[PDB]
Amino acid sequence: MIKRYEACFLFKSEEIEYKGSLEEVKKSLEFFGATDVVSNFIGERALEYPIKKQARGRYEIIEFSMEGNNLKEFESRLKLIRNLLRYMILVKIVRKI
């Protein structure tokens, strides 16, 4: 079942590593069959509790579509990216409609 997922990712501070990490994330979704990938940069904020020794990082929102069964596997692969500090994947909002 194709499901409209929406996810948030945190990357470490410097720009080149941010961009590279985001690139393998994007190719990762494409390999796992994601469709309608759209991003939205949130900025570069100072974290208010340190994560993996870092104190400052850049936030990304990705709103894609993808079938259910590959979430398991996709997740199992997102642990390999060195520069992805934290993230969460959510089903769509409870929109007022």
Binding site: C8, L10, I42, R45, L47, E48, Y49, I51, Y59, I61, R86, M88, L90, I93, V94, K96
Partner: protein, 63 residues
Amino acid sequence: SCKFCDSGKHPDYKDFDFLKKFITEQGKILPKRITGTSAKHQRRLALEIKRARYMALLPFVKK
């Protein structure tokens, strides 16, 4: 007196600077009876605050 009902926008962790007003000055959630919000909005607001705290958008305790 539910601010989310008044503004017509619904709680969301991405909108974290707005979330910061329903938090005490070091992270604790405010009660309904104080902030005067509706029950459904309060439940969604608590869930979103927890999500943000998981993303370090919001603090567990200020340091």
